[PDB]
Short mmCIF file of C-alpha atoms in Angstrom, two decimals:
data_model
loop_
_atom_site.label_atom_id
_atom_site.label_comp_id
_atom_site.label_asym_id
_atom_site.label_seq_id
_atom_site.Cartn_x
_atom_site.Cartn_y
_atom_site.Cartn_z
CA UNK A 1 67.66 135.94 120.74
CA UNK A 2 67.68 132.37 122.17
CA UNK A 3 69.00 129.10 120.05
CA UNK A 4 68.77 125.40 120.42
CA UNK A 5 71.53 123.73 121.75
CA UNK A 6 74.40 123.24 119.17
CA UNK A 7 77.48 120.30 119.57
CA UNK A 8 80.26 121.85 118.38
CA UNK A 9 82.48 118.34 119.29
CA UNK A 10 80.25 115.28 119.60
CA UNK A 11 80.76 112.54 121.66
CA UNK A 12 84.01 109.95 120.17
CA UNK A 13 83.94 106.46 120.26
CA UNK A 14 86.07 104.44 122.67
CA UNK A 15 87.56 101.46 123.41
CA UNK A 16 89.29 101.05 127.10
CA UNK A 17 90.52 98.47 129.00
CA UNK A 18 88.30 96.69 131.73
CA UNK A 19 89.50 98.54 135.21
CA UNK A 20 90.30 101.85 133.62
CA UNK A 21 88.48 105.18 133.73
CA UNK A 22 86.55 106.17 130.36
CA UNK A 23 85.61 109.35 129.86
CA UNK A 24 83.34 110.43 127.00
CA UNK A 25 83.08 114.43 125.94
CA UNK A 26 81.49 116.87 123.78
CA UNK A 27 81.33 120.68 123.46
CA UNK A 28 77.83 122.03 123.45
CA UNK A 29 77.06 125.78 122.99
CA UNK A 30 73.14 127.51 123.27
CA UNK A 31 70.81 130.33 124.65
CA UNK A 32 70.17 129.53 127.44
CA UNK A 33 73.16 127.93 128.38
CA UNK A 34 72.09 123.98 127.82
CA UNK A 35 71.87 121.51 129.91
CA UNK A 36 73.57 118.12 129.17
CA UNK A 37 72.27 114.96 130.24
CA UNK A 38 73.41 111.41 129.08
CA UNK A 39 72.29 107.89 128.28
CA UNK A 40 73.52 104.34 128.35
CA UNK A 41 71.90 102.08 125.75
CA UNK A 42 68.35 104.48 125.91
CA UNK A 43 68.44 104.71 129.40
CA UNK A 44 69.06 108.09 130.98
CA UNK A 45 71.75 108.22 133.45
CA UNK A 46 71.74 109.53 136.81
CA UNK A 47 74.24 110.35 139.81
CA UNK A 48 75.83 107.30 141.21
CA UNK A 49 78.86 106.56 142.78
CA UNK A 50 80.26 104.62 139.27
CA UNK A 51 80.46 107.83 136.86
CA UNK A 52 81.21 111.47 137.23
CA UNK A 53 79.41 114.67 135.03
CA UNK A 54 81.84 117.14 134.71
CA UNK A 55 82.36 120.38 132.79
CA UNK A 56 84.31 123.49 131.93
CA UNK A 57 82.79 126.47 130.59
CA UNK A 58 81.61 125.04 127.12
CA UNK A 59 82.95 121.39 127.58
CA UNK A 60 81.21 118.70 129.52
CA UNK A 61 82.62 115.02 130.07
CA UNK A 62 81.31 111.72 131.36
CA UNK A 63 83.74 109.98 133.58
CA UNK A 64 83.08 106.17 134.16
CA UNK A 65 85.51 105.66 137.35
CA UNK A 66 86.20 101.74 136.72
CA UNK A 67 85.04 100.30 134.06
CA UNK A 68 83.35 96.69 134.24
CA UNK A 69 82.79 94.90 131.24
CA UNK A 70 78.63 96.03 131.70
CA UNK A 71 79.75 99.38 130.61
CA UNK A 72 80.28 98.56 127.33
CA UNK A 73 77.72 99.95 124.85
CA UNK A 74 75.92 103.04 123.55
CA UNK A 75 76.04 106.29 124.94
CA UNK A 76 74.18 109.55 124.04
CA UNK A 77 74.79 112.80 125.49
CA UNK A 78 71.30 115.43 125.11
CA UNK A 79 71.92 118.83 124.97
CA UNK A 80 68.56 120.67 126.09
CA UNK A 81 67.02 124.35 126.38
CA UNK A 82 64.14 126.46 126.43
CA UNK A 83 64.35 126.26 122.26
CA UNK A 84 65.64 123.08 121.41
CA UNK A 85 67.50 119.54 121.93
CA UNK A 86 70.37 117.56 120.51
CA UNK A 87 71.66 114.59 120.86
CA UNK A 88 74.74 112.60 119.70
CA UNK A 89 75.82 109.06 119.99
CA UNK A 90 78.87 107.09 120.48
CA UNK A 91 79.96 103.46 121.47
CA UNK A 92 82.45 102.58 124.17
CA UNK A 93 83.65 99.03 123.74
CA UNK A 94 85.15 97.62 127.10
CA UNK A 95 87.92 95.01 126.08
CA UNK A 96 88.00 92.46 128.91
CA UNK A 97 89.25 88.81 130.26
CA UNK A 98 88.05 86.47 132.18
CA UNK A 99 85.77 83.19 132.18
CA UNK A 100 82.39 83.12 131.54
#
């Protein structure tokens, strides 16, 4: 009676402006419920004072607070249990100015 995790939304591209908040989402759904972890360009992302994790019952959300042009790239959200992992991937383009 347990099952890998499942997205039932996976995560959207984006493009945002440099200085505004991004958030990135999926819906997930598994026995037990899964865990969901994320990734920037194959790196695995952990708390920091620059993004938020957030969720509501079957939703989850990654908040980037203020984006900087760095930001920009590949993200993949992991949904993990006891029977299973997903993943899903997306692109946020950051559309800045400046010199350099």
């Amino acid at each position: 009676g347990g099952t890998g995790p499942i997205f039932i939304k996976e995560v959207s591209n984006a493009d945002i402006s440099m200085g505004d908040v991004a958030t990135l989402s999926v819906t997930v759904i598994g026995i037990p419920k899964p865990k969901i972890q994320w990734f920037f360009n194959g790196v695995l992302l952990t708390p920091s004072a620059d993004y938020k994790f957030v969720f509501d019952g079957d939703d989850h959300s990654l908040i980037i607070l203020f984006t900087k042009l760095e930001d920009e790239g590949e993200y993949t959200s992991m949904a993990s249990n006891d029977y299973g992992k997903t993943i899903c991937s997306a692109y946020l383009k950051i559309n800045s100015k400046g010199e350099g």
